[PDB]
Design a protein around this nucleic acid. Structure first.
Ligand SMILES: Nc1ncnc2c1ncn2[C@@H]1O[C@H](COP(=O)(O)OP(=O)(O)NP(=O)(O)O)[C@@H](O)[C@H]1O
Lengths: 538, 66, 48
DNA sequence: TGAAAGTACTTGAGCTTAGACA
């Protein structure tokens, strides 16, 4: 079997024999394209390249790391990015446009710097695999500078089979991966279990801790490590705090600098700074074999992000704890954040129920943090796995009693300055009342013959066209009652009279209930004039 | 006001840290957080600390050295 | 034009016509006492 | 059995993120 070349490459070119897991071996023999698309979930290993091929890695750090690693592994691999040298880019474009692994970022994949090159490599059929690297939900996430490919790459690249690579494969996430990437059915599922016994998963509540700084300092003392503070310069704050408490910690707010991080990262690689704090960053740097803790000071966004950032610990298998510091205030703040994000998102794009997929992802995180049971069991349930049968190494596994008491205490822990306080309280307590999928607009246009000037107007929110028609009919009945009390001309002019009255009320109104109140106020005036026996003038 | 926010000493050497000084009656406490914890700051220690302040560094502090 | 300048206010949110409610959040703030807070805030800081 | 007020201190909080181009 070419498996002979696989063995030779592993022995000499790779430095292995693919024996860490037989599952990845079966995946490698699956990528020989005896099947209709293979869905492998990169876990504690890789086997691509063998299984010119374009590498779709969204972040250039992985592009560099991998191409230099393969070059040191005696492999001729090329990379294409904008930050690359102009002369190097020109010579690479020259030697690729005419006569074995290409690493590119999607920014120029659909741009003029590579699209003619893409067509040249497609028409000449020089491509054998269109593989997207760390194809995590990365696909279905972010600025989305890539369809995913739909037929704009999966098909635009008729050949180049196309293989997927995501750390987290939950049922909905993986089926949406297939739907977006247009992976041809039946996609060969090669999914590794997410259970890991080397991580002591636990959750500590900041409110219950008298001094969270001291508790987290004690945690990192009993252990490299990457604590995760959300954002808002709180990363720098926490780094200084720990440095004050005796933990040499640095920061990685995206608002720093490639320079700032360039060293900030390598310092950490060689244990110059044992602890490094990142906001949501550090999608790379995952080769340390130590990572003794990835405790999250702030809650993550979903099981996808949490699991991806937390599995980086214990690469060699040694225990690495990893915690999550939870705050109800943080929970509702991030809930506000995502809700306003999707509210502005619908204002610029379509329905895209993935917007709500995000909100129940966050709710799944919240309920996992606030549930009672094995954390490994919860992550397996979210990822579709089975019972982990994990021994001590959980909050519930090690001591069920203490966690229950802590949760019970947390339940009882609920209870011009007040203006912001009341505003926050009201908004957070009624925002949650709206529930999931808060899009619900479905603006109905005027059907065929609405007697409504500027009927297609969105000035008054939640004012249906049918409601305005109902108010117009009520005004029409009022005018007809006035007609059979004062003997006006006819109904043909009364129709326009009612239309004009409704339009005047609409212009004078700003919100729906006020508009209805004004409509009802006119109706009485009319009836009153009919009782006054006088015609209802202007 | 400017210096009460600088918890670290860099400029110059001495990259070590700064404790919080808290007054309880007649005693000053060098309250190191964890870098024992509440070491009593004896007046001998503060006298030794003050003795090494340069004339320029006390002039900027506002107190004329002479 | 009545006998009691009466005003009625509700707290309409429902759920935009979705499926019931499963595992509601702990701090739901039941509408009765949420209406308590709403009425108190209106009676105290409305600045009409 | 019932000041009153002005000033100098602390202490906590705390607020989006993502890579490319730029
Ligand atoms: N069969 C194997 N035998 C030996 N070493 C292997 C094997 N498979 C993978 N490895 C090594 O394990 C490393 C980790 O791969 P992988 O877990 O995909 O990377 P990661 O960035 O640490 N985690 P991930 O999020 O899944 O990408 C690879 O780079 C290989 O060096």
């Amino acid at each position: 079997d070419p498996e002979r070349r696989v063995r030779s490459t592993l022995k000499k070119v790779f430095g292995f024999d693919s024996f860490k897991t037989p599952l990845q071996e079966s995946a490698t023999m699956a990528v020989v394209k005896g099947n209709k698309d293979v869905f492998v979930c990169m876990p504690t290993g890789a086997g691509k390249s063998l299984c010119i091929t374009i590498v779709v890695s969204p972040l250039i750090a992985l592009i560099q790391d991998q191409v230099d690693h393969l070059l040191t592994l005696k492999v001729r691999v090329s990379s294409l990015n904008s930050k690359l040298s102009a002369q190097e880019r020109k010579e690479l474009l020259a030697d690729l446009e005419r006569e074995k692994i290409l690493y590119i970022t999607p920014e120029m994949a659909a741009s003029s710097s590579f699209q003619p090159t893409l067509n040249s490599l497609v028409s000449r059929h020089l491509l054998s695999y269109l593989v997207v690297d760390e194809a995590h939900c990365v696909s279905q996430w972010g600025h989305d500078f890539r369809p995913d490919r739909l037929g704009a790459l999966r098909s635009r690249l008729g050949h180049a089979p196309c293989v997927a690579l995501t750390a987290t494969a939950t049922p909905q996430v993986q089926e949406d991966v297939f739907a977006a990437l247009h992976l041809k059915k039946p996609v060969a599922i090669f999914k590794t279990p997410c259970f890991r016994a080397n991580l002591f998963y636990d959750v500590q509540f900041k409110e219950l801790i008298s001094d969270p700084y001291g508790n987290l300092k004690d945690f990192c003392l009993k252990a490299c490590g990457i604590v995760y503070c959300r954002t808002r310069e709180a990363c720098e704050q926490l780094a200084i705090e720990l440095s004050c408490r005796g933990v040499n910690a640095k920061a990685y707010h995206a608002g720093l600098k490639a320079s700032e991080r360039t060293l900030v990262q390598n310092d950490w690689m060689e244990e110059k700074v044992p602890v490094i704090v990142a906001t949501i960053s550090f999608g790379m740097g995952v080769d340390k074999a130590n990572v003794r803790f990835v405790a999250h000071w702030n809650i993550a966004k979903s099981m996808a992000g949490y699991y991806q950032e937390s599995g980086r610990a214990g690469r060699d298998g040694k225990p690495s704890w990893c915690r999550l510091y939870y705050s109800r205030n943080d929970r509702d703040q991030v809930s506000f954040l995502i809700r306003k994000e999707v509210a502005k998102l619908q204002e610029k794009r379509g329905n895209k129920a993935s917007d709500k997929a995000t909100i129940m992802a966050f709710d799944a995180l919240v309920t996992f943090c606030e549930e009672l049971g094995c954390r490994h069991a919860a992550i397996a349930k979210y990822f579709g796995d089975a019972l982990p049968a994990c021994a001590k190494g959980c909050d519930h596994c090690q001591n069920p009693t203490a966690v229950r008491r802590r949760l019970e205490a947390l339940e009882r822990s609920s209870s011009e300055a007040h203006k912001r306080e009341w505003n926050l309280f009201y908004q957070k307590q009624m925002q949650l009342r709206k529930g999931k999928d808060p899009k619900i607009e479905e603006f109905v246009p005027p059907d065929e013959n609405c007697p409504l000037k500027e009927a297609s107007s969105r000035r008054i929110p939640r004012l249906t066209v049918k409601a305005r028609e109902h108010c117009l009919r009520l005004l029409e009945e009022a005018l007809s009652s006035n007609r059979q009390s004062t003997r006006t001309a006819d109904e043909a002019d009364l129709r326009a009279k009612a239309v004009e009255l409704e339009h005047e009320t609409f212009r004078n109104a700003k919100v729906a209930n006020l508009y209805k109140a004004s409509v009802l106020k006119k109706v009485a005036d009319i009836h009153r004039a009919s009782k006054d026996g006088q015609p209802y003038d202007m | 006001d400017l210096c009460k926010g600088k918890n670290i000493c860099e400029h110059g050497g001495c990259g070590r840290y700064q404790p919080r000084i808290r007054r309880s009656g007649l005693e000053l406490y060098a309250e190191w957080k964890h870098v024992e914890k509440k070491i009593l700051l004896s007046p001998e220690r503060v006298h030794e600390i003050f003795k090494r302040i340069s004339d320029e560094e006390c002039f900027v502090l506002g107190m004329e050295p002479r | 034009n009545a006998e009691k300048l009466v005003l009625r206010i509700r707290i309409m949110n429902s759920d935009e016509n979705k499926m019931q409610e499963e595992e509601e959040v702990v701090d739901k703030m039941d509408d009765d006492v949420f209406l308590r807070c709403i009425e108190s805030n209106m009676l105290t800081d409305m600045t009409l």
